Amino acid sequence: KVKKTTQLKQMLNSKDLEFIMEAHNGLSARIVQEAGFKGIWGSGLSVSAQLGVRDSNEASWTQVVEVLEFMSDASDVPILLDADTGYGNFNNARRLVRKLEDRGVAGACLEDKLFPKTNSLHDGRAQPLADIEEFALKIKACKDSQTDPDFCIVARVEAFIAGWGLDEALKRAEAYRNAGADAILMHSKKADPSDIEAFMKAWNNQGPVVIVPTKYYKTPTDHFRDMGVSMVIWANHNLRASVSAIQQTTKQIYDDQSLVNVEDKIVSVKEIFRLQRDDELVQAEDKYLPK
Template sequence: MFQRVIRNFASKKKTTQLKEMLTNKSLEFIMEAHNGLSAVIVEEAGFKGIWGSGLSISAQLGVRDSNEASWTQVLEVLEFMSDRTKIPILLDGDTGYGNFNNARRLVAKLEQRGIAGVCLEDKLFPKTNSLLEGAKQTLADIPEFAKKITACKDTAKDPDFCVVARVEAFIAGWGLEEALKRAEAYKDAGADAILMHSKKSDSSEIEAFMKAWNNKLPVVIVPTKYYKTPTDEFRKWGVSMVIWANHNIRSSVKAMQETTKLIHDNESLVPVNDRCVSVQEIFRLQNQPELKTAEDKYLKF
């Protein structure tokens, strides 16, 4: 029965899958991926959706999370991710790479590549990562950002394409009143959900927002800093979706650092070989068996 439900869910459009995840009564989870390979791994693990993390995509390109990777470069990475998976991708679209015009062009191109939604944050371009210590976090004017949300919704051809408005009021040092005012404005502008962000090591700001918000619109959270909060608390507050935002890139960096250092220091593969997946597993993740089947069909005469 459970497998049939999963198959039925996966047979729907990716946009519809994401929209239903945001609007149903269950707490849903999406996991960070940053290239085609990690996207496949996320899907195989059983996640119903992927977070196209701006931090992770920029990191795997070796640049800073300050819009140093252009939106077209990000789009190219997303295309590989989307081509290899059947589950929806929600892109961390930063500020939309400019004003309303840049943001709506981004939406048009995301739809062409089968991306299910975009999350836009109410800060200024170029963006500053929300968890960067000591960085100034300047917020966009509410009316300007609200119009950006509306422009994106007006541009989307698929009514299920989701635009998530990310509120950075807590990140910038403002209080609950400002967070609520911004969330309300973005709801009225047509946002499909609100992502309420916090960098505190406890979840007090999120809890306060959820109690005051009263389920006016689905709420997405990113508990990177307050990871010790029990997940059932999020359910109790009525959170719609949790994003595990950067742990694939962080864990892969740790593994590569350790492996590379061992090879360098030992001048041998012996210490690391058993710590690595086999080359055959890489072939499997690359979908090599499909090519063999296609060759048997098209190259045998």
């Protein structure tokens, strides 16, 4: 086999546009794999949401790592985890990376936002971000700490999101890429791809770029290919679909006080057993238990 880390690294450096799909628990990870996706996106929003908490580092980094451990155990394709800012400074970030590596996770995506939120000024001006040298050094520490040379570090640049412009975005991307980032994730808050286009034009293909088209989803996918984008992340759609189904199913049963109107609309219990790989255990039990 090919290591999961190697699988992800090849995807980031390939000449084709690659896609990874959001999963938020072991069950969704297996479903994503069975569908044919070559990679999984461990969404920070999805993992926190399934736990019932906010996407503001309320769950501890070890609790996040445990969710991902079950996800990694349930899939053969690489998982790239959204690790926010690394849960602290360079030291907390490299400790996280080593634990992820040991659990089979393929890479981690770190962002250059200030953590945690210390002020509440809600004006209309740009938001200060982590110092560029500090973040670049954080990326360097993670790369230096890896025991698997193919584990990936993706740097998420928050320049556009925070209200700054192309110049700030480019400076940060170049700095992180020079520090060893395996890819740059360029995001924006616009409902169109303009920030992405401006960046790809100025970037001059200095390294793989990852994008998240959630808000500009009507953009033709071939346009990303034309721009030389390396990977697209479908960020949170399984979580969103799960919520719609659970809200709908729950209301139906609540209203009917019966299962008649949901039984034919959901997978069978046997399909759950199949997704749990119950057959493999049945066989193991017949081989390892006395008759």
